[PDB]
From Swiss-Prot:
Site residues, Important for ice-binding: 9, 14, 18, 44
Subcellular compartments: Secreted
Organ and tissue specificity: Detected in blood serum (at protein level).
Name the record gives this protein: Ice-structuring protein RD1
Gene3D superfamilies (UniProt xref): Antifreeze-like/N-acetylneuraminic acid synthase C-terminal domain
Family, per entry: Belongs to the type-III AFP family.
Amino acid sequence: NKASVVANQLIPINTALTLIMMKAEVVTPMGIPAEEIPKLVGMQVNRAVPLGTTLMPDMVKNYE
């Protein structure tokens, strides 16, 4: 089990992701793989993402 993107602070609804917002941790269930962090920068979340929440594909606008 590989590391996922996890929120490093509360990320408000509709906020564009920045690097300070995204830590990487081995969690279950699996979220977006950690290697995607630099590619996620600039993309908005479609809901608030509390600190410690695993970031999932469905939470990111325009993510495939």
